[PDB]
């Protein structure tokens, strides 16, 4: 549906984020991870603004990957919550947090953070 | 199966709408007690349907685009966490609120916070 | 002064003996009762020495590298949050903690929470 | 004291942080933000593992400024976590929370997360 953040996307690790941005502001497609305690492609789902500002800011987005598909399950989920900045040398400049099911015990260290930049592959 | 779908609400006072399938989706709105929002919003997301047996959570997260037929707020919050289920069912997680800035602000785009969800 | 000086807990039982000085700075040590981590370690951090007037919380953070004499986790903790002093004294922070890694394995060198602190 | 960390660096704002990582395991010295409620040089303060590990990782550190000098006061504190990576092109490379002071009605948006790179200028 938008032509700009629809495509096959690439991160700085090498993952693969395939996505359209649908009329309905829903974003749709699979992700597969280049790390971690994932193989293959997994189910996304988010949503993003159909109707971004028009003073130059980007478009906010974000996205949910639970990290199980038929072959691996690693009882973890990350979402992705940033920026579509369009243009000739596009990006979803994104901030994201997975967490891993733990044991209230270990809690405390249930939540990784990072950042991931995506640029398409188109 | 998980106990997800129902409604929740958090410690600001905000109310989660859930649907969980069988698949690992999540379904449903949003309604902020706070900041630049008014009335329910879409959101989806996904959790782990094949959680462990061990008393470990479940992990899930969603998004919620901040544009609804009321309001636009240009921003989008994303919820990462996890499950437990019962009676007295807790979704404890933490959250990543983007507005769209210039590339210049986007140092100023992002809050960062935990909520904690307990069933209505 | 600002009442932040003390001992004190959080839930997860860690203890934080600080000392805030006139000019901003905390020194002391903390103690976790979690992860790879022994006895005391050396922290530091700043605090708003002329927080405003209106019922706002103190702005604060603190840094511990987990080496002491004891154990080496090869890791750092910033906590980030707000001080609010009186009978009832509370921090509420969110923190970073960095393992040092290779750059390889950047994506999953930082843990994310929150921890709240009240006076002992 | 440790000459790889020691110095003075930028990061992609354009903000100096000029620092001295001492025998002690302190960092010491000041900040000077590019952007936001700042003018001037800040007091910052931090620690560092002055032992790091032998395997090729990062030395771990964290610094925290309070964004209160001679001359403004935002009412804030930024606290930057990461790790320092040495080698001919060493970098700093950082995520932060920046907290403000706020009501408990407003402590919701209180803090902003995001990552800088350091990079030395020496
Ligand atoms: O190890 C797991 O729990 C599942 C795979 C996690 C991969 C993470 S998601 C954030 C970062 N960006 C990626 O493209 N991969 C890693
Ligand atoms: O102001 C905006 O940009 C839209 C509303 C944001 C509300 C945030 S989302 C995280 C936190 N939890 C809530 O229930 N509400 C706030
Ligand atoms: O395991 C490590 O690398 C060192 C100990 C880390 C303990 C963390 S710091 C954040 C959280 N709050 C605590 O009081 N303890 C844990
Ligand atoms: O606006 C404020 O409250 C004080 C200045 C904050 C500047 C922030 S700290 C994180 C980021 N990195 C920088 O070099 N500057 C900004």
């Known amino acids: 549906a938008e032509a700009g953040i629809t495509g096959t996307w690439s ?18 497609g699979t992700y597969e991870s280049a790390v971690g305690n994932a193989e293959s492609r997994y189910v996304l789902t988010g949503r993003y603004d159909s109707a971004p500002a028009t003073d130059g800011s980007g478009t906010a987005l974000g996205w ?4 199980k ?4 399950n690693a009882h973890s989920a990350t979402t992705w919550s940033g920026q579509y900045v369009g243009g000739a040398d596009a990006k979803i400049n994104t901030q994201w947090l ?4 733990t044991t209230n ?7 990784l953070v990072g950042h991931d930049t ?3 592959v188109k």
């Open 69 to 72: 598909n038929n072959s691996k």
């Open 118 to 120: 995506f640029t398409k």
């Open 64 to 67: 949910t990957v639970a990290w």
């Open 98 to 101: 997975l967490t891993s099911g």
């Open 11 to 28: 991160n700085q690790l090498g993952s693969t984020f395939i996505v359209t941005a649908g009329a309905d502001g829903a974003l749709t």
């Open 105 to 111: 015990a270990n809690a405390w260290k249930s939540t």
